[PDB]
Amino acid sequence: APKAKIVLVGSGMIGGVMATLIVQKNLGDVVLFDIVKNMPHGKALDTSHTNVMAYSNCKVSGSNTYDDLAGADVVIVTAGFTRDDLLPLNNKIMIEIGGHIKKNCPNAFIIVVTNPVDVMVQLLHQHSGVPKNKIIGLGGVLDTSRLKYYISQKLNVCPRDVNAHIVGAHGNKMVLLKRYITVGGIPLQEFINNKLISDAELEAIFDRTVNTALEIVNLHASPYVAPAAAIIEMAESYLKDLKKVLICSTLLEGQYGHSDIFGGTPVVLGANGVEQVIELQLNSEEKAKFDEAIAETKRMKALAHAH
Amino acid sequence: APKAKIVLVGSGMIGGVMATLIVQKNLGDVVLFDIVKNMPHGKALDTSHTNVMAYSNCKVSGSNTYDDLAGADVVIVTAGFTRDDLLPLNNKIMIEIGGHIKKNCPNAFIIVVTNPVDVMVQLLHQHSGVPKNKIIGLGGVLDTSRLKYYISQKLNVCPRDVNAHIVGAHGNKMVLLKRYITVGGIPLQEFINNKLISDAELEAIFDRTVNTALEIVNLHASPYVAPAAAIIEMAESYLKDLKKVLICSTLLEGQYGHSDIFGGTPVVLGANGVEQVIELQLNSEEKAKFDEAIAETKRMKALAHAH
Amino acid sequence: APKAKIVLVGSGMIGGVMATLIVQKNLGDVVLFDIVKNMPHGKALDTSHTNVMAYSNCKVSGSNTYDDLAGADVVIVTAGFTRDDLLPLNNKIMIEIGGHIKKNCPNAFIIVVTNPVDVMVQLLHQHSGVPKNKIIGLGGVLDTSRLKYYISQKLNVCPRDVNAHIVGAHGNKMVLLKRYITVGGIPLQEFINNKLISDAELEAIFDRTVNTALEIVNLHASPYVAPAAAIIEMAESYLKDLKKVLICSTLLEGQYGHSDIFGGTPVVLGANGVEQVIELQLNSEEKAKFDEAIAETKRMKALAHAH
Amino acid sequence: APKAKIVLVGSGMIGGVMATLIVQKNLGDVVLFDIVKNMPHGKALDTSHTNVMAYSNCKVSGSNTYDDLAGADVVIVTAGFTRDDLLPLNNKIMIEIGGHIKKNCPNAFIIVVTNPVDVMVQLLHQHSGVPKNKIIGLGGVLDTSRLKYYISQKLNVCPRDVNAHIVGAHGNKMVLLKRYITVGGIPLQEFINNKLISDAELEAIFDRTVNTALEIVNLHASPYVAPAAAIIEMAESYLKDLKKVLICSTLLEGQYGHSDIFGGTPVVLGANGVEQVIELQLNSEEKAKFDEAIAETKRMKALAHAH
Ligand SMILES: COC(O)C1CC(Cl)CCC1NC(O)C(O)O
Ligand SMILES: COC(O)C1CC(Cl)CCC1NC(O)C(O)O
Ligand SMILES: COC(O)C1CC(Cl)CCC1NC(O)C(O)O
Ligand SMILES: COC(O)C1CC(Cl)CCC1NC(O)C(O)O
């Protein structure tokens, strides 16, 4: 059938929530791929029964065979070891997966999750051969969900009604752009002026946003639900030609003064993949922060090449 | 049952789409009220069958009896004649409906649609006795849907990703605030700077927005689908405690320099009705336009009182 | 874009609700076609604004040009005059539309609504040249929505949890199969045995079901909301490859003893159109009723050919 | 706010999917309760960010404090050790939780998951003091999702279009009622007669259904996604007054010849909790199987009382 085929390369915790959400949303058939024997088949079987509760009709299958990438419309990569020593190990995984994408599904739209995402997405771009508009990395949708959510709780408004931009890279050098925050489309500064939220409060929210993964890990949990939902928002925009503006890691070709590297910026996602790369008109102080993010991606990319 | 009861006072074209959408969304039981015999019962019966297709369970009943307002959680008023000569006639309808609200459902949340809305909502406020946080008028959600949509089509982005503010009043004096337009939370001016949309294009879109009802009437149609969807977005925010920021007509108590009048401004809608009135920090030129909108509402309110 | 294109041939009341529902469900781009000037453009414009409220991205355009059928994935025909004298007039409309389908969109999936549907669907099948699996008529989903709904109200259960079969033809000779009614998958007879609903009650519900269109017309309304929702359930099953079992008019090739005629029977609708025709194992008494339905379709088909 | 408060007593794998699904569906505020320190707060924080992606507004909080049951509208119990030796241990947990329900939320609707469910639900009923219509156990929705799904895959129909009844108890003595299976509301026997599925195939599907939890465990996974979706279907029916017919464990008062015990049977779930208990008109052979299921529940209930 013309139902979409979505292959999850990596069947860990994020993969499991993704399969669940795909079925809830009836988005397409799902392959849970992993090199681990049996497990993806088990998760696939459990998930498949939810078609009944959800009134959906998506096949959910497990796989240890890379050739099941054939016919994929979307491929979502979470596979990888989870420190700089892991970089060359995860490069080798991106190499392996990229060769299989080129062979089996060169026209697939690819979303990379493996950290550090801004590095790993470019490695997979290089090894898979796919066009620049057909591969992105997770970052900004996830990072801004935290910022938007925390502000919405202070202001007692619907979370989605807060909008915000975090750019450059996923990770500790993410650039939180105070000037680009709105509430119901209104500049956040109006709310600061009105003493509904203070500058000091926002500073604390910014730090919390940057450190959220660490906060969750120290609570004896770890982030997989919100990462999964962010990825599925991205995949859905592609599959349904929604043309949502979503911040993702993408190949820069001069934007922000940078080329020959991936970084986080708003893009438009629809049926042609990355339909538009939107370059924020950053001031010099914001650009300097963007530059630090890119420098760190470059540092790690260099370590990834050889053991 | 604790299912919400939603009474549509007026069972014309907007009422018919509202009942349809309530069932699609399983939002509550529906009464289609009208003074017209038989017709509301017919529309109610037709609509009721869609529970099957929608997997919903909402009762849909017709009514010619005002006492069926008893137990209403939400009351949506579209009743009215459709020029200044109609003002005193529609005031008498608001009086009649207000007396029935006070008697039967004083705790209901009230949405007024009857034009001119900014006048009629205040008349109903006065005659119904309901608290200021429990009655609003349709305006800005509908008017901004046009502006957002037209810009989204030029920019090839998801319509909801354009945000915009139109304030003061529904109608020909609506205030379109160019400074408060964003695309993916980014100021529209960045897109103008980048020559993705021009100032001249936006001027044409502004005029189209103001004249949209007329454009549709001259096409041998008339607006009822988008008005209905806007109203249901508002009602839904209340019923589900979404706390969405939505522009509606509400009692001003000093905002923008105005008191003892209703006008269009962003508000937050949740379980307590109007939870917050948001006052945009308008500059003097924008305030002058706001003042013209209010002056027109006042002119018409004065004509409404006596035949 | 690979977004589906859905052309509504006929932009009357059913067409207007269909366009609304397509946007709510983000199912595809919509053309409201009619021979009436201006009106489809007006309805299209009104409807298009609801993309904002619905978080959808479907184009909604009006058209007086048949060549806009090009590229259609789904075509829904409601055009027609609304008595036997109309039969040859509506045949000529089916001829005209069929020629345009063959030319512009021979691979489209076609849903016919024009009454009498079981006749008009076959005429369009003949004139369009499309495969037997790619054209169906509205009937059973709509007629059974009434029966299911009325029983659900008596039994105080979710409407969708009542299932029921009405076959043969849409219209006054529809065959209501008492033996094929279930409630939560349980035979209705168990509920009769338990005195939760009586045989006399069901007889009254059967008559009400057959006469529902007339009941609504006499209430100074007419059925368009539930017909629209039924059609969109069918179209959605096709577009999303849901493989729902839905009763529709389809070409019979021996089922029930009948060939070379369309009639109402459960079918499975997915990406290949009619994937399966399900033949109920009717007893002789039920078959006799089926035969009467077919005889009436044949009588009218013969009158349709010439003025 | 009148937003529902849903307390998940137990924040393990099923609890985590439940919180995710509640947010996706905007069903209410969520407390993830556990005796484990920190972890529920971590899962709560991760999940809370999905309000943004989902356009929802549900609070998600963690808790180690039983008094946070106050104000709960729905309480879902998954807490428990996971063999007969565990029975007295899990009884003590039900005792503890029941005392806290009686004190803090005596009017809450309670769903029990802890295995063996048909025993543990009755123990919690006894210790909590809640009315018989306000507490149910998970079983039949989950078990029948497997049966429905497996048949739908053989017949190439939408999974939800297969209906089926499994009664008596959750667990290895579940009663699979071949006579009560339908496909699009049609008796499955018609499909057997037509050689679309054989008796031997159905026997294999029956065994697979009974052993599904074991099949998933042996695949180096374990069932939590489909159990969570089943529970949320039940909770949703209550919260939204859907009046769905759903098979759950409930207090029997003579049905099937049994009293003073809980067992699996179709019930109707709406705003008043268990609105109707539906007693299938089982034949003597089916009743004998039902009796074996009840006997096993009784055996285990007796072991639960003392260490
Ligand atoms: C740690 O290894 C993985 O998790 C993994 C997962 C996938 Cl989905 C593919 C390949 C993977 N690994 C390798 O190819 C490898 O070189 O170890
Ligand atoms: C033109 O009259 C109406 O449409 C109408 C509608 C409702 Cl729903 C109530 C009262 C109404 N009218 C009056 O009370 C009236 O004074 O005419
Ligand atoms: C009564 O005429 C119609 O409503 C109509 C509608 C469409 Cl959509 C096509 C053709 C139509 N008519 C004709 O072709 C005609 O022969 O009159
Ligand atoms: C194994 O213990 C649990 O998992 C547990 C969970 C909850 Cl949510 C409450 C009480 C619990 N336990 C006890 O009260 C206990 O007696 O151990």
Short mmCIF file of all heavy atoms in Angstrom, two decimals, chain C residues 236-281:
data_model
loop_
_atom_site.label_atom_id
_atom_site.label_comp_id
_atom_site.label_asym_id
_atom_site.label_seq_id
_atom_site.Cartn_x
_atom_site.Cartn_y
_atom_site.Cartn_z
N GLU C 236 -12.14 8.83 3.50
CA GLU C 236 -11.02 8.72 4.43
C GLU C 236 -10.48 7.30 4.46
O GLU C 236 -9.27 7.11 4.53
CB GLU C 236 -11.44 9.15 5.83
CG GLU C 236 -10.33 9.11 6.85
CD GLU C 236 -10.79 9.46 8.22
OE1 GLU C 236 -11.86 8.98 8.66
OE2 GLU C 236 -10.03 10.23 8.88
N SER C 237 -11.37 6.31 4.44
CA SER C 237 -10.93 4.92 4.45
C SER C 237 -10.04 4.58 3.26
O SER C 237 -9.03 3.85 3.40
CB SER C 237 -12.11 3.96 4.59
OG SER C 237 -11.59 2.64 4.84
N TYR C 238 -10.42 5.13 2.10
CA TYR C 238 -9.62 5.02 0.90
C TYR C 238 -8.27 5.73 1.05
O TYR C 238 -7.19 5.13 0.87
CB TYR C 238 -10.39 5.58 -0.30
CG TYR C 238 -9.55 5.60 -1.56
CD1 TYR C 238 -9.30 4.42 -2.26
CD2 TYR C 238 -8.99 6.77 -2.04
CE1 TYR C 238 -8.53 4.42 -3.41
CE2 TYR C 238 -8.22 6.78 -3.18
CZ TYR C 238 -7.99 5.60 -3.86
OH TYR C 238 -7.22 5.60 -5.01
N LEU C 239 -8.31 7.01 1.40
CA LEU C 239 -7.13 7.85 1.42
C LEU C 239 -6.08 7.39 2.41
O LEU C 239 -4.87 7.49 2.11
CB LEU C 239 -7.51 9.28 1.74
CG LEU C 239 -8.21 10.03 0.59
CD1 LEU C 239 -8.82 11.32 1.06
CD2 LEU C 239 -7.25 10.28 -0.54
N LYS C 240 -6.53 6.87 3.56
CA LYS C 240 -5.63 6.44 4.63
C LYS C 240 -5.40 4.92 4.70
O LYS C 240 -4.74 4.43 5.62
CB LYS C 240 -6.15 6.94 5.97
CG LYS C 240 -6.21 8.43 6.11
CD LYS C 240 -6.34 8.80 7.59
CE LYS C 240 -6.29 10.30 7.84
NZ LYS C 240 -7.32 10.66 8.85
N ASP C 241 -5.95 4.19 3.73
CA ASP C 241 -5.84 2.72 3.68
C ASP C 241 -6.27 2.09 5.01
O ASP C 241 -5.59 1.23 5.58
CB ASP C 241 -4.41 2.31 3.29
CG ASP C 241 -4.30 0.86 2.95
OD1 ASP C 241 -5.28 0.24 2.44
OD2 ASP C 241 -3.21 0.25 3.12
N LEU C 242 -7.44 2.51 5.49
CA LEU C 242 -7.95 2.00 6.76
C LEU C 242 -8.54 0.60 6.67
O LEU C 242 -8.51 -0.13 7.67
CB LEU C 242 -8.95 2.97 7.35
CG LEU C 242 -8.33 4.19 7.99
CD1 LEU C 242 -9.38 5.28 8.24
CD2 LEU C 242 -7.67 3.74 9.31
N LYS C 243 -9.01 0.21 5.49
CA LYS C 243 -9.64 -1.10 5.26
C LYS C 243 -10.86 -1.32 6.16
O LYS C 243 -11.12 -2.43 6.61
CB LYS C 243 -8.63 -2.25 5.37
CG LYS C 243 -7.41 -2.09 4.46
CD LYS C 243 -6.44 -3.25 4.54
CE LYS C 243 -5.11 -2.97 3.87
NZ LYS C 243 -5.31 -2.60 2.42
N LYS C 244 -11.60 -0.25 6.40
CA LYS C 244 -12.88 -0.35 7.07
C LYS C 244 -13.89 -1.10 6.24
O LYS C 244 -13.94 -0.98 4.99
CB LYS C 244 -13.45 1.04 7.39
CG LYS C 244 -12.79 1.75 8.60
CD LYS C 244 -13.44 3.14 8.73
CE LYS C 244 -13.22 3.78 10.00
NZ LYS C 244 -13.95 5.05 10.05
N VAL C 245 -14.74 -1.84 6.95
CA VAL C 245 -15.89 -2.48 6.38
C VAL C 245 -17.02 -1.44 6.42
O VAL C 245 -17.44 -1.00 7.48
CB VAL C 245 -16.30 -3.75 7.15
CG1 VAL C 245 -17.53 -4.40 6.48
CG2 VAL C 245 -15.14 -4.74 7.25
N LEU C 246 -17.49 -1.06 5.24
CA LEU C 246 -18.48 0.03 5.09
C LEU C 246 -19.48 -0.41 4.01
O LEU C 246 -19.06 -0.94 3.00
CB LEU C 246 -17.79 1.33 4.66
CG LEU C 246 -16.79 1.95 5.67
CD1 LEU C 246 -15.96 3.00 5.09
CD2 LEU C 246 -17.48 2.55 6.84
N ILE C 247 -20.78 -0.22 4.23
CA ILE C 247 -21.79 -0.64 3.23
C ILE C 247 -21.93 0.45 2.20
O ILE C 247 -22.25 1.59 2.55
CB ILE C 247 -23.13 -0.95 3.89
CG1 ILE C 247 -22.93 -2.05 4.95
CG2 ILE C 247 -24.14 -1.38 2.84
CD1 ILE C 247 -24.16 -2.37 5.79
N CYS C 248 -21.70 0.09 0.96
CA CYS C 248 -21.75 1.02 -0.15
C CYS C 248 -22.35 0.31 -1.35
O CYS C 248 -22.36 -0.91 -1.41
CB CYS C 248 -20.33 1.47 -0.54
SG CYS C 248 -19.32 2.09 0.83
N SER C 249 -22.79 1.11 -2.31
CA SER C 249 -23.24 0.59 -3.59
C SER C 249 -22.05 0.22 -4.47
O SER C 249 -21.18 1.05 -4.72
CB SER C 249 -24.12 1.59 -4.33
OG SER C 249 -24.80 0.92 -5.38
N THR C 250 -22.06 -0.99 -4.99
CA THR C 250 -20.92 -1.50 -5.75
C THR C 250 -21.43 -2.47 -6.82
O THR C 250 -22.54 -2.99 -6.72
CB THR C 250 -19.89 -2.19 -4.79
OG1 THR C 250 -18.63 -2.42 -5.45
CG2 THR C 250 -20.36 -3.59 -4.34
N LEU C 251 -20.62 -2.68 -7.85
CA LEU C 251 -20.99 -3.61 -8.93
C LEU C 251 -21.06 -5.05 -8.39
O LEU C 251 -20.06 -5.61 -7.91
CB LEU C 251 -19.97 -3.55 -10.06
CG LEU C 251 -20.27 -4.49 -11.25
CD1 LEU C 251 -21.56 -4.07 -11.89
CD2 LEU C 251 -19.08 -4.50 -12.21
N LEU C 252 -22.23 -5.64 -8.55
CA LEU C 252 -22.45 -7.05 -8.23
C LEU C 252 -22.12 -7.91 -9.46
O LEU C 252 -22.43 -7.55 -10.58
CB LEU C 252 -23.90 -7.23 -7.81
CG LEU C 252 -24.36 -6.37 -6.64
CD1 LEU C 252 -25.85 -6.61 -6.24
CD2 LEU C 252 -23.41 -6.58 -5.45
N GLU C 253 -21.44 -9.02 -9.21
CA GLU C 253 -20.98 -9.97 -10.23
C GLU C 253 -21.39 -11.39 -9.84
O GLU C 253 -20.65 -12.34 -10.07
CB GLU C 253 -19.46 -9.87 -10.38
CG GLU C 253 -18.99 -8.52 -10.90
CD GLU C 253 -17.46 -8.40 -10.91
OE1 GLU C 253 -16.85 -8.24 -9.84
OE2 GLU C 253 -16.88 -8.50 -11.99
N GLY C 254 -22.60 -11.53 -9.31
CA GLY C 254 -23.12 -12.83 -8.91
C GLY C 254 -23.58 -12.89 -7.48
O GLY C 254 -24.32 -13.80 -7.10
N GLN C 255 -23.11 -11.96 -6.65
CA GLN C 255 -23.49 -11.96 -5.25
C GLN C 255 -24.97 -11.75 -5.15
O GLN C 255 -25.55 -10.96 -5.89
CB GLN C 255 -22.78 -10.85 -4.48
CG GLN C 255 -21.25 -10.92 -4.49
CD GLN C 255 -20.59 -10.10 -5.58
OE1 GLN C 255 -21.21 -9.74 -6.60
NE2 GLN C 255 -19.31 -9.85 -5.41
N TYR C 256 -25.58 -12.49 -4.24
CA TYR C 256 -27.01 -12.44 -4.01
C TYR C 256 -27.83 -12.87 -5.21
O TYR C 256 -29.04 -12.68 -5.26
CB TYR C 256 -27.42 -11.05 -3.56
CG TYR C 256 -26.60 -10.49 -2.42
CD1 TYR C 256 -25.65 -9.49 -2.65
CD2 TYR C 256 -26.78 -10.94 -1.10
CE1 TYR C 256 -24.91 -8.94 -1.59
CE2 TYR C 256 -26.05 -10.40 -0.04
CZ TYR C 256 -25.12 -9.41 -0.30
OH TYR C 256 -24.40 -8.88 0.71
N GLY C 257 -27.16 -13.51 -6.16
CA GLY C 257 -27.79 -13.94 -7.40
C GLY C 257 -27.89 -12.89 -8.48
O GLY C 257 -28.61 -13.09 -9.47
N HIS C 258 -27.17 -11.78 -8.31
CA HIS C 258 -27.33 -10.60 -9.18
C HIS C 258 -26.05 -10.20 -9.86
O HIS C 258 -24.97 -10.18 -9.25
CB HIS C 258 -27.87 -9.40 -8.40
CG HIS C 258 -29.31 -9.53 -8.04
ND1 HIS C 258 -30.32 -9.15 -8.90
CD2 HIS C 258 -29.91 -10.09 -6.97
CE1 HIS C 258 -31.48 -9.40 -8.33
NE2 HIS C 258 -31.27 -9.98 -7.16
N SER C 259 -26.17 -9.81 -11.13
CA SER C 259 -25.04 -9.34 -11.90
C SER C 259 -25.49 -8.13 -12.71
O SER C 259 -26.68 -7.88 -12.83
CB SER C 259 -24.47 -10.46 -12.80
OG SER C 259 -23.94 -11.56 -12.04
N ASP C 260 -24.53 -7.38 -13.23
CA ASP C 260 -24.72 -6.32 -14.23
C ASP C 260 -25.60 -5.19 -13.69
O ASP C 260 -26.26 -4.44 -14.41
CB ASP C 260 -25.26 -6.93 -15.52
CG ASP C 260 -24.29 -7.99 -16.09
OD1 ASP C 260 -23.13 -7.69 -16.43
OD2 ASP C 260 -24.64 -9.21 -16.15
N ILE C 261 -25.35 -4.96 -12.15
CA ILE C 261 -26.19 -3.95 -11.53
C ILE C 261 -25.37 -3.60 -10.30
O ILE C 261 -24.55 -4.43 -9.88
CB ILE C 261 -27.58 -4.56 -11.16
CG1 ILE C 261 -28.60 -3.47 -10.89
CG2 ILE C 261 -27.47 -5.49 -9.95
CD1 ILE C 261 -29.04 -2.73 -12.15
N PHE C 262 -25.57 -2.38 -9.79
CA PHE C 262 -24.97 -1.97 -8.51
C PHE C 262 -25.99 -2.13 -7.41
O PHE C 262 -27.19 -1.91 -7.61
CB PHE C 262 -24.49 -0.52 -8.52
CG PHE C 262 -23.15 -0.30 -9.19
CD1 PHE C 262 -22.95 -0.66 -10.52
CD2 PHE C 262 -22.12 0.32 -8.52
CE1 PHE C 262 -21.71 -0.42 -11.13
CE2 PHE C 262 -20.90 0.56 -9.12
CZ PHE C 262 -20.68 0.19 -10.40
N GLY C 263 -25.53 -2.52 -6.22
CA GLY C 263 -26.39 -2.54 -5.06
C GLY C 263 -25.55 -2.45 -3.79
O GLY C 263 -24.34 -2.66 -3.81
N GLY C 264 -26.24 -2.18 -2.70
CA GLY C 264 -25.64 -1.95 -1.41
C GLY C 264 -25.23 -3.24 -0.73
O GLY C 264 -26.05 -4.16 -0.57
N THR C 265 -23.97 -3.29 -0.34
CA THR C 265 -23.44 -4.42 0.39
C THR C 265 -22.19 -3.96 1.14
O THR C 265 -21.51 -3.01 0.70
CB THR C 265 -23.17 -5.61 -0.61
OG1 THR C 265 -22.81 -6.78 0.12
CG2 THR C 265 -22.01 -5.30 -1.58
N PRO C 266 -21.85 -4.62 2.25
CA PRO C 266 -20.57 -4.32 2.89
C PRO C 266 -19.41 -4.57 1.93
O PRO C 266 -19.37 -5.59 1.24
CB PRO C 266 -20.51 -5.32 4.08
CG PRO C 266 -21.54 -6.36 3.78
CD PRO C 266 -22.61 -5.65 2.99
N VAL C 267 -18.50 -3.61 1.88
CA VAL C 267 -17.24 -3.72 1.18
C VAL C 267 -16.12 -3.28 2.09
O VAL C 267 -16.36 -2.65 3.12
CB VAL C 267 -17.21 -2.84 -0.09
CG1 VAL C 267 -18.30 -3.26 -1.06
CG2 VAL C 267 -17.33 -1.38 0.24
N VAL C 268 -14.89 -3.58 1.70
CA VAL C 268 -13.73 -3.11 2.44
C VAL C 268 -13.07 -2.04 1.61
O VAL C 268 -12.77 -2.29 0.44
CB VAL C 268 -12.73 -4.28 2.70
CG1 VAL C 268 -11.45 -3.77 3.37
CG2 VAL C 268 -13.37 -5.35 3.55
N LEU C 269 -12.83 -0.86 2.20
CA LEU C 269 -12.28 0.27 1.45
C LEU C 269 -10.88 0.56 1.90
O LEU C 269 -10.64 0.83 3.08
CB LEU C 269 -13.16 1.52 1.60
CG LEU C 269 -14.57 1.48 1.01
CD1 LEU C 269 -15.23 2.85 1.12
CD2 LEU C 269 -14.62 1.00 -0.44
N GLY C 270 -9.91 0.46 1.00
CA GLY C 270 -8.56 0.87 1.32
C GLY C 270 -7.87 1.45 0.12
O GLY C 270 -8.53 1.94 -0.78
N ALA C 271 -6.55 1.35 0.07
CA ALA C 271 -5.76 2.05 -0.95
C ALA C 271 -6.03 1.56 -2.35
O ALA C 271 -5.76 2.28 -3.31
CB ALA C 271 -4.28 1.94 -0.64
N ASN C 272 -6.53 0.34 -2.49
CA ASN C 272 -6.85 -0.20 -3.82
C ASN C 272 -8.33 -0.01 -4.15
O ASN C 272 -8.85 -0.65 -5.08
CB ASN C 272 -6.52 -1.68 -3.94
CG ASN C 272 -5.08 -1.98 -3.74
OD1 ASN C 272 -4.74 -2.76 -2.86
ND2 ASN C 272 -4.22 -1.35 -4.52
N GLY C 273 -9.01 0.88 -3.43
CA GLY C 273 -10.43 1.12 -3.63
C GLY C 273 -11.26 0.08 -2.91
O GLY C 273 -11.06 -0.15 -1.71
N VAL C 274 -12.18 -0.56 -3.64
CA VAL C 274 -12.96 -1.68 -3.12
C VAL C 274 -12.03 -2.91 -3.08
O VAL C 274 -11.76 -3.56 -4.11
CB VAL C 274 -14.21 -1.94 -3.97
CG1 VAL C 274 -15.02 -3.11 -3.45
CG2 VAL C 274 -15.08 -0.68 -4.01
N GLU C 275 -11.51 -3.23 -1.91
CA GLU C 275 -10.56 -4.35 -1.80
C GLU C 275 -11.20 -5.73 -1.74
O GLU C 275 -10.60 -6.73 -2.17
CB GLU C 275 -9.66 -4.11 -0.60
CG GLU C 275 -8.84 -2.87 -0.92
CD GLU C 275 -7.71 -2.62 0.00
OE1 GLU C 275 -7.61 -3.32 1.06
OE2 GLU C 275 -6.94 -1.70 -0.34
N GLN C 276 -12.47 -5.73 -1.22
CA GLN C 276 -13.27 -6.93 -1.03
C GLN C 276 -14.72 -6.54 -1.09
O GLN C 276 -15.10 -5.49 -0.59
CB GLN C 276 -13.03 -7.60 0.34
CG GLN C 276 -11.60 -7.86 0.68
CD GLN C 276 -11.43 -8.37 2.08
OE1 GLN C 276 -12.21 -9.22 2.53
NE2 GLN C 276 -10.43 -7.81 2.79
N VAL C 277 -15.53 -7.34 -1.78
CA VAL C 277 -16.97 -7.24 -1.69
C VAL C 277 -17.42 -8.37 -0.76
O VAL C 277 -17.12 -9.56 -1.01
CB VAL C 277 -17.62 -7.40 -3.07
CG1 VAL C 277 -19.12 -7.33 -2.96
CG2 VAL C 277 -17.14 -6.32 -4.00
N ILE C 278 -18.13 -8.03 0.30
CA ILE C 278 -18.56 -9.01 1.26
C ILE C 278 -20.01 -9.33 0.99
O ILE C 278 -20.86 -8.44 0.92
CB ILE C 278 -18.32 -8.53 2.71
CG1 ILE C 278 -16.84 -8.29 2.95
CG2 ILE C 278 -18.85 -9.56 3.70
CD1 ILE C 278 -16.51 -7.65 4.25
N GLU C 279 -20.27 -10.62 0.77
CA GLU C 279 -21.61 -11.09 0.47
C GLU C 279 -22.17 -11.70 1.75
O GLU C 279 -21.68 -12.71 2.24
CB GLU C 279 -21.57 -12.14 -0.65
CG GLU C 279 -22.95 -12.68 -0.99
CD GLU C 279 -22.98 -13.70 -2.11
OE1 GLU C 279 -21.96 -13.98 -2.73
OE2 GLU C 279 -24.09 -14.20 -2.37
N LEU C 280 -23.19 -11.06 2.29
CA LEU C 280 -23.86 -11.59 3.46
C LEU C 280 -24.57 -12.88 3.08
O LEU C 280 -25.19 -12.97 2.00
CB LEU C 280 -24.84 -10.58 4.02
CG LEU C 280 -24.28 -9.23 4.46
CD1 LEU C 280 -25.38 -8.31 5.00
CD2 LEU C 280 -23.21 -9.36 5.53
N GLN C 281 -24.51 -13.87 3.96
CA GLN C 281 -25.19 -15.16 3.74
C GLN C 281 -26.68 -15.04 4.11
O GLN C 281 -27.14 -15.58 5.13
CB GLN C 281 -24.44 -16.27 4.48
CG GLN C 281 -23.07 -16.48 3.86
CD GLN C 281 -22.11 -17.31 4.66
OE1 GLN C 281 -22.48 -17.99 5.62
NE2 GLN C 281 -20.83 -17.22 4.27
#
